[PDB]
Structure 1
Amino acid sequence: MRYTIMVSATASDAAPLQFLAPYSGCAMAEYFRDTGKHGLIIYDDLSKQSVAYRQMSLLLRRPPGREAFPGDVFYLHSRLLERAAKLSKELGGGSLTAFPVIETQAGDVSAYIATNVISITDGQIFLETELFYKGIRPALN
């Protein structure tokens, strides 16, 4: 915890707070990105941030799309995850590494938000449940 910041917008917190908490955390880590240092950030369950944003948009009477998500749910995560950058030498050389977490349903990799963030992030650490209940932990696919 000497190096960790912990931003928590939990399940009882309001949906704008769950929507905004990845951006708050990414700003707090962009401090270390922008001043030459290095940062790590885990946005744990962006699949719950997208549900908070779906709640906010559907309560604003905005027309839902695929899986009742708004049309700008891609922009929600691409605005966030493009800030995890490795800066040039002239801007400091700082870096920010993101580890977004997405929860699938039955190994459905082809969900809407899952295929959104797969096409935003660089790599992918897919964790399978068939390897997990066979005791192989970390259950890396």
Structure 2
Amino acid sequence: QFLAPYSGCAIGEFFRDNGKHALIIYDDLSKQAVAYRQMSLLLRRPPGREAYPGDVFYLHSRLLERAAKMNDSLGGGSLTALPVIETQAGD
């Protein structure tokens, strides 16, 4: 679950780097945080607020930061992302 989002993102970069356009959709990412939180707690790492690791931000950022619009010289390709998030009580 932790690696699936990055695996799919690489498939989208293919179309991006070849001048093509791709739209990658990421189902609810809270599942990834739980999966990553699982591995973190099992690694004896110190949990932060809401039991999430301190690098949970970098987990999602590094992924979404790769989805962008390449210039025309490189091919003009793009990679659209539609991350989903589930809110417990709509807060």
Are 2:19 and 1:36 equivalent residues in the alignment? Answer: yes
Work out the CA distance in 2 between the residues paired with 1:78 and 1:92: 24
What amino acid is the match of 2:9? Answer: C
Counterpart of 2:56 in structure 1 is: 73
SS in 2 for 1:103: coil
Counterpart of 1:84 in structure 2 is: 67
SS in 2 for 1:19: coil
Choose 1 or 2 for highest CA Rg: 1
Are 2:54 and 1:46 equivalent residues in the alignment? Answer: no
Deviant stretches of 4+, over 6 Å: none
**5+ long unaligned stretches in structure 2:** none
User: Please, what TM-score do these two structures have when normalized by structure 1?
Assistant: 0.64
Percent same amino acid among aligned pairs?
87
- Deviations, residues 86-138 of structure 1 (Å, cap 9, x unaligned): 00112110000000000001111xxxxxxxxxxxxxxxxxxxxxxxxxxxxxx
Distance apart, 1:66 and its partner CA: 1.1
- Whose strand fraction is larger, Structure 1's or Structure 2's? 2
**5+ long unaligned stretches in structure 1:** 1-17, 109-141
Are 2:9 and 1:22 equivalent residues in the alignment? Answer: no
Larger RCO of the pair (alpha carbons < 8 Å, separation 6+): 2
User: Please, what TM-score do these two structures have when normalized by structure 2?
Assistant: 0.97
Residue of structure 2 aligned with 1:55, choices 24, 38, 46:
38
Work out the CA distance in 2 between the residues paired with 1:88 and 1:50: 32
Are 2:69 and 1:95 equivalent residues in the alignment? Answer: no
Counterpart of 1:107 in structure 2 is: 90
Work out the CA distance in 2 between the residues paired with 1:46 and 1:91: 30
Counterpart of 1:128 in structure 2 is: none
